[PDB]
Amino acid sequence: ASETFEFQAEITQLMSLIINTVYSNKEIFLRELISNASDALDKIRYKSLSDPKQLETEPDLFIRITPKPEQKVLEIRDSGIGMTKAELINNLGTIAKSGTKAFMEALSAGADVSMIGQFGVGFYSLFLVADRVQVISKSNDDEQYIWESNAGGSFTVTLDEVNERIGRGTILRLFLKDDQLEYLEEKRIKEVIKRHSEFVAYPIQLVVTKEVEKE
C-alpha cells in the first residue's frame, strides 16, 4: 500500500530553496543528519532504561554510513527509536512547518544556510546534495515503511516490501545529485565526519568496499 500526502506550504518552500541554492559548503548536510541520528539513538536509549525489552529488536546503538557507488546513493543509518507510519508523515511532512517558515524568514534576512539546524529543520539540508530521498524506518511500534520525496511538494509512504528488513531504526537513503558524488568517497566522508562528530556518544561506522590494490 502506498499513500501520498502534501507537505505544509512552508516546508515545500524551504525544500525548493535548498534544492536549488548555490551554497558552497554543502558538506554541512552530514553534520545535520548525524545530529538527528544521535537524537534518535538517545530516544531509544532513554526508553530502554525502564523498558530494556525495547532494545531486543536491535541490541546495538549505532550510526552507520554506507556509500553505494553503483547507485550513486549514500545511506545514513541509525538504530534509534525509528518512526511509525504516522510519525514519518507528521515528523517529516507536517510538524516542521513553523521551523521552515522561521528559517526561510531568516535566510531572506541574510542568515547563512548553515544555521538550518538551529531551526530544528536540519533534515531538509540533505537536498543540498540529493535530489531525492528514501527514508526507511522501523519502529518497535509499527511495520517497516518507506517515506519518499523528490522535493515536489508531496511525499509518499509505502509499506516496505523491497528493502532489507532492519531490526529497528532509520535509514536515510540519499540519491546524490550528479555533481555531488564526492560524498561516496571514503576519504571525503571521513574528513567530513571527524570535523564535527566529536560529541557523538555512539559509534559511527563507515562501510566501504574496496578492491584490494597493491604496494
Add this chain to the structure above:
Amino acid sequence: ASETFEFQAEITQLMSLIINTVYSNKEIFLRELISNASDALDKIRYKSLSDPKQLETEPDLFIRITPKPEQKVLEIRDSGIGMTKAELINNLGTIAKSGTKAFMEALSAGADVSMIGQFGVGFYSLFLVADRVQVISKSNDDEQYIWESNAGGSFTVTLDEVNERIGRGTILRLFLKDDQLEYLEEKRIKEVIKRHSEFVAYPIQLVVTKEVEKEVPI
C-alpha cells in the same frame, strides 16, 4: 537442516586433523579458498563463452571478502558457477575422499600442511581458523542451498530461506575460532592476500566496516 549425510570416513579424519593441528602458518587457508573461488569463476566464464545467458543471473565475476566481527564470521564470496544441492553433497562430502587420504599419508611421510592444495582438498584448511562453516550456494541450475559442517562426520544441506539471495555463486561463511579473530581485520587480510593471492585473475573486493575514530581520543 533439511537433509543430513555422512562424509566419507577419510574426509572426517582430515577435518579432525586440521581443526586440531597446532600448525603455525594458518594464513594459508585464505589462499586456498581464494584459489577455489577463482576456479569456480573460471567455470562459468568458460561456460558463458557459448552460453552468455548464464552470466545474466550475476554479470560480474569477482571474489568478495566480508569480515563480520560481531558474529566473529569471515565470509568469502565468489560469483562463480555455484553448486546445486547435489553438487554441494558430492563435491564437499564425497569426492574429496581420495585426495584427503593421500594428503594424510603425505603428512605422515613429512609433508607440510601448506601443500594441501596439491591434493585438491585445500577447502578443508578452513578448519585451521574456523570451528564451523556454512557453504551457501546458488547454481543457475538449482535453488539456493546451505551446506553446513563442524568437522564432524556428518553434514547437512538445507534449502536456503534465511540468508540474503545471491544472483549466482558461493559464499564460504566461516565461524572463526576464538584465537583466530585476526582474520577479521582489514590490514591483516590485505597482507595475507598480497603475500599469497596477489595475482588472481579476478577483482578481490574487501567489504570493511570501520568505526570512524574521534578527532582527538576520548
